[PDB]
Amino acid sequence: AIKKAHIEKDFIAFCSSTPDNVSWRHPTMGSVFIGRLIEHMQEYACSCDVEEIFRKVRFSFEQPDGRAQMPATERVTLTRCFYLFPGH
Amino acid sequence: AIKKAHIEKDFIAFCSSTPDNVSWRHPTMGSVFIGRLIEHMQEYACSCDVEEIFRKVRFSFEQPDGRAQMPATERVTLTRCFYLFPGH
Amino acid sequence: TSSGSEGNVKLCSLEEAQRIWSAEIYPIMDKSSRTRLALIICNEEFDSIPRRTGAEVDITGMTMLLQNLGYSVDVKKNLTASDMTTELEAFAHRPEHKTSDSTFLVFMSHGIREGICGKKHSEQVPDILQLNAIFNMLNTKNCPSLKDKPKVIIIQACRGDSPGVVWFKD
Amino acid sequence: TSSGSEGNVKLCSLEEAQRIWSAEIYPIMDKSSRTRLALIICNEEFDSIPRRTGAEVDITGMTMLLQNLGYSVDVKKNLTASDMTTELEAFAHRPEHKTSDSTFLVFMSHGIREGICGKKHSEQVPDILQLNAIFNMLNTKNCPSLKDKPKVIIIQACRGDSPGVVWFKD
């Protein structure tokens, strides 16, 4: 027997900036978004779902400097919370 | 004194279906997404933030019938949780 | 009771509000002074596309819900993409946003992959409002009064012709 | 300790895992048998666009992080949009996804509004991978093995030329 499934589901995209706008990369320290993402994943994967972690990353960019960017989540079809449960 | 602010921040869009795909509307009962959204907002605004409510709406569409659709959140730059605190 | 201003929306109690209240929540303005605004654009009658029967149910439902949540609701019907743009621009200029903490924008119409259909839309002569334009008109540059405030955009429309499904076996 | 397989990622304890475990969480497969996969595509050397200095730091950081989280990581470098498409299609066909519970896709390159730049990109002859193509190649139709499983897409790139800021006064 065959059954129907949604063609597109359980996706989340997270981009380094908003549409039209630049994303920054330090020549020796690496991409600002990438570095910030790793730090937040290392700290919050144990206690927060992916959507919440990405929100925290966005908050950390809130106060703009000379090199500003605001990461954005896109085309989200997560129907449940995605916890990484690191260590398990 | 002048200060810099992000051009695009604190947005959330919620679409009735995924890209390329149809959204359904009952001739007498109204749009399925709209009706489902109202029910979830009425039930969960007291206890859940908007992102969580939208996730719950997505979950309610999970099992596809003859008229299927999967709502999607788009271009999200919410940096905090948005609670409606209904009654306050 | 549903006889109150919040209607069928379940209330958040004072004890549940304190349990939620974290430094990661959007601030809520005083209920006595705040002037929350919401906009609903709903296209039902079109020149070339079939009538969206049941749209009045959507209008009633969303209007009452947003009012229940504390928003004063503008309802605009049967607009071209140009008219929707003018209406969005006027909404962005509303003085009430300065003394508001958030906003809701609701769009309900026929739709294609590119965006939302205006009243005059046809395949030969497209009349489309893109989601990109909606964001631009409501951002910090074009709507400084809504800086740092949640802007919730709700869109009821097709995004193409596909049924959105695939088959699988057990 | 950081000497373990999870490195610098803070561990979730058994008591904290039970506090989280709701019927609204994605299921996690047995650690002993699961075969988690992740893909990193990073473009550093280009034909016409300046060298992305520091990209190796990004590659190192993301590779180690995803491994810490339990994913076996493929790293592919300096690809055209066509090569990225071929690589995505091959990743979607990997048998390990069947015995996996999730996936991560990481894209790092120069970028424009339309999407992500391939190695041969120039203003005269564009070489772009759209985000839309990434979703299509990983959806239920083209990647049935990842049905009902979280697919996390991370993109480091510009999305245009604008600084992303506006001025305001106090």
Query: How is residue D152 annotated by DSSP?
Result: E
- Cβ of residue D168 closer than 8 Å to a chain B Cβ: yes
Strands D128-129 vs D116-117: parallel, antiparallel or unpaired: antiparallel
CB of D152 closer than 8 Å to CB of D105: yes
Structure tokens given for B24: 């359904």
CB of C37 closer than 8 Å to CB of C74: yes
Cα-to-chain-centroid distance, residue B1: 38
CB of A31 closer than 8 Å to CB of D108: yes
Please report, for residues A40, C98, D38, the alpha-carbon distance to residue D62 in angstroms, rounded to integers and kept in the order given: 12, 42, 10
Which range marks the domain in which residue B52 is found?
A: 1-88
Strands D72-77 vs D128-129: parallel, antiparallel or unpaired: unpaired
Any idea what the CATH number is for the domain that residue A53 is in?
A: 3.30.70.1470
CB-CB under 8 Å, B76 with A74: yes
Please report, for residues A80, B24, C46, C55, the alpha-carbon distance to residue B29 in angstroms, rounded to integers and kept in the order given: 28, 11, 20, 9
d(CA A9, CA D148): 7
- How many separate domains does chain B show? 1
CA count, 13 A, side-chain hemisphere, C10: 12
CB-CB under 8 Å, D164 with B1: no
Per DSSP, the three-state class of A85 is: coil
- Cβ of residue D166 closer than 8 Å to a chain C Cβ: yes
Structure tokens given for A16: 């380094």
**Which positions ≥6 away from D125 have C-beta within 8 Å?**
none
Per DSSP, the three-state class of A71 is: coil
Per the listing, tokens 């969206």 go with C52
Please, what is the angle between helix B50-60 and helix B32-44, to 10°? 130
CB-CB under 8 Å, D140 with C147: no
**Which positions ≥6 away from C82 have C-beta within 8 Å?**
C118
Please, what is the angle between helix D55-68 and helix A32-44, to 10°? 20
Q: Is D158 a catalytic residue?
A: yes
CB of B70 closer than 8 Å to CB of C13: no
E strand or H helix that includes residue C167: strand C165-169
What's the longest Cα–Cα distance across chain C?
A: 58
CB-CB under 8 Å, B81 with A58: no
- Cβ of residue C82 closer than 8 Å to a chain D Cβ: no
Nearest to A18 among B8, B71, B74 (CB): B8
Structure tokens given for D120: 């041969």
Query: How is residue A8 annotated by DSSP?
Result: S
Residue B12 sits at φ, ψ, to 5 deg, of: -145, 125
What's the longest Cα–Cα distance across chain B?
A: 59
- Give me the architecture of the D1-170 domain, per CATH: 3-Layer(aba) Sandwich (3.40)
Give me the resolution in angstroms, 1 decimal. Answer: 1.8
- Cβ of residue D152 closer than 8 Å to a chain A Cβ: yes
By the 10 Å C-beta count (0-12 exposed, 13-18 middle, 19+ buried), D167 is classed as exposed
d(CA C24, CA C4): 30
| Nearest chain C alpha carbon to B15 | C155
Structure-determination technique? X-ray
